[PDB]
Design an enzyme around this catalytic site. Structure first.
Site, mmCIF file in Angstrom:
data_model
loop_
_atom_site.group_PDB
_atom_site.id
_atom_site.type_symbol
_atom_site.label_atom_id
_atom_site.label_comp_id
_atom_site.label_asym_id
_atom_site.label_seq_id
_atom_site.Cartn_x
_atom_site.Cartn_y
_atom_site.Cartn_z
ATOM 1 N N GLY A 60 0.735 -1.170 -0.018
ATOM 2 C CA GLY A 60 -0.004 0.164 0.071
ATOM 3 C C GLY A 60 0.953 1.200 0.258
ATOM 4 N N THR A 61 0.113 2.348 -0.047
ATOM 5 C CA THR A 61 0.649 3.698 -0.146
ATOM 6 C C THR A 61 1.105 4.146 1.386
ATOM 7 O OG1 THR A 61 -0.833 5.310 0.586
ATOM 8 C CG2 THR A 61 -1.081 4.466 -1.704
ATOM 9 N N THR A 62 2.077 4.814 1.624
ATOM 10 C CA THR A 62 2.670 5.378 2.853
ATOM 11 C C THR A 62 1.827 6.159 3.486
ATOM 12 O OG1 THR A 62 4.769 5.497 1.493
ATOM 13 C CG2 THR A 62 4.986 5.656 3.973
#
Lengths: 231, 250, 235, 111, 244, 240, 241, 243, 195
Positions: free
Chosen positions: H29-31
């Site tokens: 996933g994105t941070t």
């Protein structure tokens, strides 16, 4: 592969194959497009027939006076989800005397889809939806995918070979965004954009379907001679 | 969520064996030895308190349990399965007997209840069988003294004397040689102590051996006086000291 | 094994796709829509000569203005008909009016997807639902175990269907009389049917606004069968 | 003891001509000997050229009108935007009311 | 989820058999043999205990013969624990019938219901069947003396003489040979024992490896009596028929 | 409760548990029904690897559902007891509410629906049974005979057979039964029934049962002798 | 073989899922130890904080279950907390239903019975934990009762749990061989805590600062955990010996 | 083997592979990050711009629970929403009964036990998210991070998603060069930088920033979003620091 | 409803049951048959609350017929009476109890005896030589106490009945429009067409 038996299993790379397979039914679906200015939002969809003796599968459903969607993939699953949405728009009216925010319609759909991806014996929804609405903060367009992921956009497309329309719309952005207060002009850009996904066939009278909603126009649908105006 | 295991976990193999009952008996086999001997005026049940560590206090771990004032039990196999069976066995003596008839159940019948629970774990959805065999010793007014064995299948049988677990084949043989129909209770306690020495390895004394009897009524153990038709329990756990006394004249 | 609500990797439901197979093994059923009515015809397909062929009920009344033909596992249809009839009668009770043909159909197609771990499998039968209503005139619908229905001008289902459909693609035009369409159904049936078409091993029916849904007796069809051979001889 | 009903008064009147119809009602709403409002309308446009009034206990009347209105919404959704004929509307209202046979809507209704 | 571990106890083989029933029947075939013989004036039940230890309490025991009511008893072959579950059901059912109709339950009606219960466990609910076969010996004033067997499939049938458990094939041939219709109780008693004597996998029959019961008109005028033989009595009937 | 879908579709579009239930039927002892001009007969094989039976008390193969309707079957016996009970109860219920005994078609239609419901419900396997159902509608003289099978499909038959070696006897009935003229009396119809079983049975011993149904709830089972007569009589005609 | 995935018997009469649950017990690589004073019961456990972004104070495997009962967990934290919450609930209900404080041994049995169920019922997994319960019971005096995933439990003179558990166990055994008695014959819990730490140090062959440890003490009528500074005092007093 | 095909099955190691596989979805996933400050907490997240058609500012990912709690997550977005909905119910019920708004540690265990509950049975799937959340209660500020196994602790700072290590590093720096504490407005800038810095591991697509915060002094105790001039100010601070 | 009577003689049971059906001030019908045949040798007369009476009679009838078909056998009168008592004894503690009183006259074929059972809505059963429900009893019990003999013929029982109906027609306040009479004996159930 060993991990595509059900929705309750994760793959060793961390994916849910039953969800991705559900996503596949969408890609096999006929193309539909959405886009909006600041004053209207439009749905244009390509209808697919079984053979030359059959009618053309309806792809657009009204949810309330101010909101509606287009579908790509499993039809019955859209009917279920559009029905759920009709209820939620309606509950919001009766109880709070309030039109349902398109943003909220999004969240509710997301949370309904999600449950069927975490529990045994269920199955994800096999359909993608584009929701347009004119609510208290203007024109809106939404993309729903049965992973649960809902996204707000100026324009987009889904179905088979939607990628053409999607890039066309990516180019045309700054033109169509400002087609404020001209309904037939916004529809043209819809019709134009959907054409980037046609192959070997083109738009006929009983094949094309358009819906529009905005500032001083209820969500209404055009088919047959009512779309002749645009081919 | 919830038990979606509503189907049987024990089923017939093509040979007609019930795998899980077979395996549960295998678990009993591994278990520490225990035994029961029926005298003419008493019944004795015994087993080895095989401690887990020397740091553990094995008085806190009771392998021989009172079920009613005149019934007691002991086991071979899995400790935790026995504990919950003793809980359910004590309660069923009340719920489906005492609270109906105002008296405690006779031995065969309480035993019969236990067997039922164990049978059900052999057929109900989502459960394995219990991994124990039980020896139940007791007295009731119209049946006298008795001794029973219950297996994971839920089957039970009445015994003059027997043993279960590890060194049972050896112990059953020993008991045949010594058992007669004229044994006074003290004689049977004595035999139980000999039979048990065979199968115990290390220490053998009143701290490593758990041993109770079903014998005479014990007014000193009643808690009250003045209903002279209430005479007290027939179940008595022999004390650490008591056991050692009988090991000098061994 | 693997769940009954499982998606294939192409994004189709195994159990629905497999039901579509069972329908292909079924007896043939044909329907045609005209400005003068809708005709429904079927292959009775008695599995032995001893069985009394009029006890084979594959065309079925739903209401006075709606009828039904089936193909596949036809024991599965009983409850779908039961539902359809209840829906129609009920609608009339609630609204003092006839139920729309499309609506009747949608209501039946809602049943279809309610299976899983609700019933335990999809239905193994396809339906041709045909009737009349004021707003949209004479209509024909193909109801599948997938939950989807399609409107057709003409349609065939069952074993003889892909052959029979290509045939209907030629012969259908917007100005067919009822009598012309009755004949087409007989004609195309005799083509695809294994054994030789007579008035015992096939059945005819129509639904007109004036007289509603009628099953034709064996005598009436025999005369249409005769009338068709006389047409075929004469060119 | 709790009395779940009340009486909000007013009166309504309907007349039908050859090619028209009227539904009229006063705009006064009362309890006991007090006026609650001098203008609180109780004859409503319900869509599909039906007008309706549910006179008696306002709370029950507002509930019924609200429900029938909503009945019209769903009739459209379920039967391809078909018009609800007056006779069908009437029958639909019979069912709304009789559904509460043993705890009634304290209203006299006209459409 | 859980489907992975489901045996599917209630399905057909492609040959149209019920796996679990067949395997249960196979379980039953290794159990002590039991025998019912019906005479004109009574019924015998005899069964062989699975192989005894000398230290077993022999008199305070039941493994094979169970009393259902005053007029009906059963011989068991299979899992005893399974059998007791079904027995208490049967006992209760007999009592309900008496309470409802003020008449003792006809032998068949009780057998049908017990058989029906068994049948259920083969068609629905995903549980294992009961690994039990019964011989029912009973009397009622409609059909008089009756013999029935039921097995794990939930099938029951009627008999003049029948065996269940181990060695039924051997035993059924021997019975078919010497059984006659006019036969009396005491002849049947003899047949029963002489058949077990021959079919047994043991060295010889001794009192301590048997359970034995009769249902004769053996009381006081038009009334039926049920005798469960004490161990001493079995010893005596064994001497008396010259088997020891 | 126990949920599992046991009757599900295969990739070829077959429901294997239904088809396997049919295998169970094919193994079961034969039965046949033949309808006269004025009656219906139910014949039933009785597997002969059984002496020491008590036939007074062994469940007969033909069952009365009401006083005017009977049901015979092939397949699992225990399964059939459940269908019969259900049918008997529906028969009594129908009299209570309609004030009329069931038609044979209606009763058959009920029983067929029960079988079908077991082919698309969780946790249950289909009935290992097919049935012949026979009788006369109330105040009607024209005979009725129907067959049901595990899948739930049902239909009417001039005459029909089910069970082991049924194709053999269907063979015989297809060539020995003229629609144009059916067995004009009871005698004649019992005859054509017995000849069809003597194709497949064995001896005419304790091997063939027959039940005869006439209109107005006029039902009776035959006994050994009367059947034996029929048997002996056919074998002497056979010496040609 | 699916007799490995759920809590049914294997052919040699064994429950692999139960065995594998014990192996998860050491998954955190922490050791714990409990002992009894005249007046008190002390439990110590190693405190290991790897990541430097963590809040040290939120890291613990000792729980206060009731005014009088403390519990130390050997095993993964999610299961640990799940067990902690359950036992708290169970101790409160006991008070309410029976009108006296739930005893250590009883709570141990009740939690043991609960784990026993997961060894028999198939839809429930066992918890990958070992629970050491401590109090000064009003009837029994200072008490240590311990629970595992098999559903077993018993009372101890003293005990240890963890990967290096056996070293600590024999270390203690040896003390009681020598001491002749069932407890640490000491006045203040402070000295019983010192004894605990000392013998863990010999057994483990390591040195602790104030944040390498965790210390619970049970006395008559409260069980309390020590702060960093309370342990530092205790460490320092050990050093000056 | 086959130990990894069913949730809640122990491997012979001692592991529940289905949970470990859920972690893979998180890592994909994105941070997202959380920074604890003196009297509050700050939350930031990376929002990839899949396409020019995404209406800027209008696909919000940070969620509030009650009035004083912020939650952000990396992984399967719908799983995150499910978990917040549960958080919202948990907080509502707590307030209804005890009147005071739910304490942050109290709240973290509610999420903890519920997520842990989804590792106990094979009929559910573990949560495809790691969640950073926290806020201000009567005891101070609290930051938590919670993982699909139901494991959670208190954090000085925290991160998860693809840029998890880059951010982890950057946060270790801050903790080390600010023993006395980091301010609320400071922590907002720092957060913007750390999201920009750890966008390197995600860099084909450019992105949208999004921050929120709870400060006793700057937001009064409550959870607000950061927009307008305070947002743009921190976008700038991060523009500078990467060049 | 109102008048129902039963006399058991040497060889049969006789049931007499009034024909009137009244609601308010209108006799709605004068030819009502307040009886149901449970089995070929068992008859049941019923009286009580409107609706309940016939609903109950037919419910019992169905159960007995279902039994008759299941066992291919006819229950004894004693058995049927014990079943019907139990049903009412159930009903009396239900949310809405059946308010029906019955008489069951049956000929037991195994014993060759006639049997008469009187059961009220409470489930109170009693075997009697003669019986009655409602106000009828007040007149007929004392009358039969005098005129009845164990060994009477069916003919003698019918004249005994005429004595009962005459006295009821003299002294009862209401018009019950005569009775329908039925005899249960070894050969089943028949109805006297002129009374």
């Amino acid at each position: 592969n060993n991990y595509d038996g059900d929705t309750v299993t994760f793959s060793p790379t961390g994916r849910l194959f039953q969800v991705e397979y559900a996503l596949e039914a969408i890609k096999q679906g006929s193309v539909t497009v959405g886009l909006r200015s600041n004053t209207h939002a439009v749905l244009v969809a390509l209808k697919r027939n079984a053979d030359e003796l059959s009618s053309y599968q309806k792809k657009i459903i009204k949810c309330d006076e101010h909101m509606g969607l287009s579908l790509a993939g499993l039809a019955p699953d859209a009917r279920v989800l559009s029905n759920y949405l009709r209820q939620q728009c309606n509950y919001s009216s009766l109880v709070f005397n309030r039109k349902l925010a398109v943003e909220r319609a999004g969240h509710l759909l997301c949370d309904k889809a999600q449950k069927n991806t975490q529990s045994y014996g269920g199955r994800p929804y096999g359909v993608g939806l584009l929701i347009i609405g004119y609510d208290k903060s203007g024109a809106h367009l939404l993309e729903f995918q049965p992973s649960g992921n809902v996204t707000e956009l100026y324009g987009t497309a889904i179905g088979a070979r939607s990628q053409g329309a999607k890039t066309y719309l990516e180019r045309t952005l700054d033109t169509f965004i400002k087609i404020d207060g001209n309904p037939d002009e916004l529809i043209k850009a819809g019709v134009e954009a959907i054409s980037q996904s046609l192959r070997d066939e083109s738009l006929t009278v009983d094949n094309l379907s358009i819906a529009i909603v905005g500032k001083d126009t209820p969500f209404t649908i055009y088919d047959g001679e009512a779309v002749a105006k645009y081919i | 969520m919830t038990d979606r295991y509503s189907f049987s976990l024990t089923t017939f193999s093509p040979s007609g064996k019930l795998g899980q009952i077979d395996y549960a008996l295998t678990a009993v086999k591994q278990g520490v030895t225990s035994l029961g001997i029926k005298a003419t005026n008493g019944v004795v049940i015994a087993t080895e308190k095989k401690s887990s560590s020397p740091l553990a206090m094995s008085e806190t771990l009771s392998k021989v349990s009172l079920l009613t004032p005149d019934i007691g039990a002991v086991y071979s196999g899995m400790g935790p399965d026995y504990r919950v069976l003793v809980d359910k066995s004590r309660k069923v003596a009340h719920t489906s007997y005492k609270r109906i008839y105002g008296e405690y159940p006779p031995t065969k019948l309480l035993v019969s209840e236990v067997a039922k629970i164990m049978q059900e774990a052999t057929q109900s959805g989502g459960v394995r069988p219990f991994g124990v065999s039980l020896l139940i010793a007791g007295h009731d007014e119209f049946n006298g003294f008795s001794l029973y064995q219950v297996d994971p299948s839920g089957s039970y049988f009445p015994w003059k004397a027997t043993a279960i677990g590890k060194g049972s084949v050896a112990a059953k043989t020993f008991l045949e040689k010594r058992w007669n129909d004229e044994l006074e209770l003290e004689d049977a306690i004595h035999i139980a102590l000999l039979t048990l020495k065979e199968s115990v390895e290390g220490e053998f004394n009143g701290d490593t051996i758990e041993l109770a009897i079903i014998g005479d009524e014990n007014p000193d153990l009643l808690g009250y006086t003045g209903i002279p038709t209430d005479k007290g329990p027939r179940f008595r756990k022999l004390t650490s000291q008591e056991i050692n006394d009988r090991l000098e004249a061994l | 094994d693997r769940g009954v609500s499982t998606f294939s990797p192409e994004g189709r439901l195994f159990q629905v796709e497999y039901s579509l197979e069972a329908i292909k093994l079924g007896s043939t059923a044909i329907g045609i829509a005209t400005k003068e009515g809708v005709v429904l015809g079927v292959e009775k397909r008695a599995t032995s000569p001893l069985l009394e062929s009029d006890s084979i009920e594959k065309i079925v009344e739903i209401d006075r203005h709606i009828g039904c033909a089936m193909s596949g596992l036809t024991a599965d249809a009983r409850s779908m008909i039961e539902h359809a009839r209840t829906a129609a009668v009920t609608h009339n009770l609630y609204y003092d009016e006839d139920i729309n043909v499309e609506s009747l159909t949608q209501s039946v197609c809602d049943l279809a997807l309610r299976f899983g771990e609700l019933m335990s499998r999809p239905f193994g039968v396809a339906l041709l639902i045909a009737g009349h209503d004021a707003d949209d005139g004479y209509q024909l619908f193909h109801a599948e175990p997938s939950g989807t229905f399609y409107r057709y001008n003409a349609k065939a289902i069952g074993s003889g269907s892909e052959g029979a459909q290509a045939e209907l693609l030629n012969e259908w035009h917007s100005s067919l009389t009822l009598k012309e369409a009755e004949l087409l159904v007989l004609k195309i049936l005799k083509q695809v049917m294994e054994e030789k078409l007579d008035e015992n091993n096939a059945q005819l029916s129509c639904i007109t606004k004036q007289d509603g849904f009628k099953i034709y007796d064996n005598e009436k069809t025999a005369e249409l069968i005769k009338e068709l051979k006389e047409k075929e001889a004469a060119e | 003891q709790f009395n779940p009903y009340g009486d909000n008064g007013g009166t309504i009147l309907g007349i039908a001509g050859e090619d028209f119809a009227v539904l009229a009602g006063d705009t006064r709403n009362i309890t006991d000997y007090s006026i609650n409002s001098r203008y609180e309308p109780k004859v409503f446009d319900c869509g599909d050229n039906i007008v309706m009034s549910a006179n008696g206990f306002a709370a029950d009347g507002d509930a019924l009108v609200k429900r029938f209105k909503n009945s019209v919404k769903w009739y459209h959704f379920d039967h391809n935007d078909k018009k609800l004929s007056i006779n069908s509307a009437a029958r639909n209202i019979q069912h709304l009311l009789y559904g509460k046979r043993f705890f009634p809507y304290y209203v006299h209704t006209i459409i | 989820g859980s489907r992975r571990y489901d045996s599917r106890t209630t399905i057909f083989s492609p040959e149209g058999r019920l796996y679990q029933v067949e395997y249960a029947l196979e379980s039953i075939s290794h159990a002590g043999t039991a025998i019912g013989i019906m005479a004109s004036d009574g019924i015998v039940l005899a069964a062989e205990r699975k192989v005894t230890s000398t230290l077993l309490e022999q008199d305070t025991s039941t493994e094979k013969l169970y009393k259902l009511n005053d007029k009906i008893a059963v011989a068991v072959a299979g899992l005893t624990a399974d059998a007791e579950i079904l027995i208490n059901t049967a006992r209760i059912h007999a009592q309900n019938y008496l309470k409802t109709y003020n008449e003792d339950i006809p032998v068949e009606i009780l057998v049908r219901r017990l058989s029906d219960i068994k049948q259920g466990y083969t068609q629905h609910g995903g549980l294992r069947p009961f690994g039990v076969s019964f011989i029912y010996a009973g009397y009622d004033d409609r059909y008089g003396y009756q013999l029935y067997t039921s097995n794990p499939s939930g099938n029951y049938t009627g008999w003049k003489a029948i065996s269940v458990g181990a060695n039924t094939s051997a035993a059924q041939t021997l019975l078919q040979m010497d059984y006659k219709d006019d036969m009396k109780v005491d002849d049947a008693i003899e047949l029963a024992l002489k058949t077990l004597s021959k079919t047994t996998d043991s060295s010889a029959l001794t009192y301590d490896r048997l359970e034995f019961a009769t249902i004769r008109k053996g009381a006081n005028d038009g009334e039926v009596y049920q005798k469960i033989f004490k161990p001493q009595e079995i010893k005596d009937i064994l001497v008396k028929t010259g088997i020891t | 409760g126990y949920d599992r879908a046991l009757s599900i579709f295969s990739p070829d579009g077959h429901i294997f548990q239904v088809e396997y239930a049919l295998e169970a039927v094919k193994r079961g002892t034969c039965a046949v029904g033949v309808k006269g001009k004025n009656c219906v007969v139910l014949g039933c094989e009785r597997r002969s690897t059984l002496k020491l039976q008590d036939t007074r008390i062994t469940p007969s193969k033909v069952s009365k559902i009401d006083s005017h309707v009977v049901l015979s079957f092939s397949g699992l016996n225990a399964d059939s007891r459940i269908l019969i009970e259900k049918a008997r109860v529906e028969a009594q219920s129908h009299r209570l509410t309609l004030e009329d005994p069931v038609t044979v078609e209606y009763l058959t239609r009920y029983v067929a629906g029960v079988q079908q419901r077991y082919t698309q419900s969780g946790g249950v396997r289909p009935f290992g049974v097919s049935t012949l159902i026979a009788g006369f509608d109330p105040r009607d003289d024209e005979p009725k005979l129907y067959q049901t099978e595990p899948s739930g499909i049902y239909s009417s038959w001039s005459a029909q057979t089910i069970g082991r070696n049924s194709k053999t006897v269907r063979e015989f009935l297809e060539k020995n039964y003229d629609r144009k003229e059916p067995p004009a009396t009871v005698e004649e119809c019992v005859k054509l029934t017995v000849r069809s079983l003597l194709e497949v049975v064995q001896t005419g011993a304790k091997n063939i049962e027959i039940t005869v149904v006439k209109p107005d709830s006029d039902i009776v089972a035959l006994s050994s002798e009367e059947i034996n007569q029929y048997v002996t009589q056919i074998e002497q005609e056979k010496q040609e | 073989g699916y007799d490995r995935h759920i809590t049914i018997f294997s052919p040699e009469g064994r429950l692999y899922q139960v065995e594998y649950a014990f192996k998860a017990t050491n998954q955190t690589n922490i050791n714990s130890l409990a002992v009894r004073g005249k007046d008190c019961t002390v439990v110590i456990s190693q405190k290991k904080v790897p990541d430097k972004l963590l809040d040290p104070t939120t890291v613990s495997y000792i729980f206060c279950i009731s005014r009088t009962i403390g519990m130390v967990v050997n095993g993964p934290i999610p299961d640990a907390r799940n067990a902690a919450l359950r036992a708290k609930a169970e101790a409160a209900e006991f008070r309410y239903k029976y009108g006296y404080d739930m005893p250590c041994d009883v709570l141990a049995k009740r939690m043991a019975n609960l784990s026993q169920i997961y060894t028999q019922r198939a839809y429930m997994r066992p918890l990958g934990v070992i629970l050491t319960f401590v109090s000064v019971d009003e009837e029994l005096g200072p008490s240590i009762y311990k629970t595992d995933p098999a559903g077993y439990y018993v009372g101890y003179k003293a005990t240890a749990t963890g990967p290096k558990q056996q070293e600590i166990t024999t270390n203690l055994e040896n003390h009681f061989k020598k001491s002749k008695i069932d407890h640490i014959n000491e006045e203040s819990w402070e000295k019983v805590v010192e004894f605990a730490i000392t013998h863990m140090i010999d057994a483990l062959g390591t040195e602790f600062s104030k944040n390498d440890l965790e210390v619970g003490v049970a006395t008559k009528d409260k069980f309390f955990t020590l702060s960093a500074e309370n342990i530092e005092e205790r460490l320092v007093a050990i050093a000056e010996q | 083997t086959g130990y990894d095909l069913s949730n809640s099955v122990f491997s012979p190691d001692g592991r529940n592979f289905q949970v470990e596989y859920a972690v893979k979805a998180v890592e994909n996933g994105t941070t997202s990050i959380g920074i604890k400050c003196n009297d509050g907490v700050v939350f930031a997240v990376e929002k990839l711009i899949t396409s020019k058609l995404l209406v800027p500012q209008k696909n919000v990912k940070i969620q509030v629970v009650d009035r004083h709690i912020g939650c952000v997550y990396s992984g399967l977005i719908p799983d995150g929403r499910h978990l917040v909905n549960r958080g919202r119910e948990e907080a509502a019920s707590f307030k209804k009964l005890y009147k005071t708004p739910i304490p942050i540690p109290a709240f973290a265990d509610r999420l903890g036990q519920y997520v842990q509950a989804h590792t106990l049975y094979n009929s559910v799937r573990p949560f495809g998210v790691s969640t950073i959340f926290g806020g201000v209660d009567k005891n101070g500020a609290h930051l938590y991070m919670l993982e699909p196994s139901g494991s959670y602790w208190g954090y000085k700072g925290a991160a998860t998603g693809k840029g998890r290590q880059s951010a982890k590093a950057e946060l270790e720096k801050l903790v080390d060069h600010h023993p006395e504490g980091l301010s609320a407005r400071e922590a907002v800038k720092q957060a913007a930088k750390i999201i920009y810095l750890a966008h390197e591991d995600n860099k084909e697509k450019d992105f949208e920033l999004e921050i929120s915060w709870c400060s006793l002094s700057e937001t009064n105790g409550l959870h607000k979003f950061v927009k307008g001039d305070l947002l743009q100010e921190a976008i700038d601070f991060a523009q500078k620091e990467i060049n | 409803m109102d008048i129902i009577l039963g006399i058991r003689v040497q060889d049969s049971v006789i049931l007499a049951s009034s024909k009137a059906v009244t609601r308010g001030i209108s006799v709605l019908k004068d030819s009502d048959d307040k009886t149901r045949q449970l089995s070929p040798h068992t008859l049941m007369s019923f009286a009580g609350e409107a609706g309940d009476t016939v609903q109950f009679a037919e419910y019992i009838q169905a159960n007995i017929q279902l039994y008759s078909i299941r066992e291919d056998y006819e229950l004894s009168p004693q058995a049927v009476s014990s079943f019907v008592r139990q049903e009412l004894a159930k009903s009396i503690r239900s949310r809405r109890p059946y308010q029906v009183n019955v008489l069951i006259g049956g000929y037991d074929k195994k014993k060759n005896k006639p049997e008469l059972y009187q059961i009220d809505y409470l489930g109170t059963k009693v075997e009697l030589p003669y019986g009655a429900h409602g106000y009828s009893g007040f007149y007929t019990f004392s009358l039969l106490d005098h005129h009845y003999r164990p060994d009477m013929t069916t003919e003698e029982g019918l004249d005994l009945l005429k004595l009962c109906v005459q006295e009821l027609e003299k002294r009862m306040p209401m018009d019950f429009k005569g009775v329908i009479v039925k005899i249960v004996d070894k050969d089943g159930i028949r109805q006297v067409d002129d009374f």
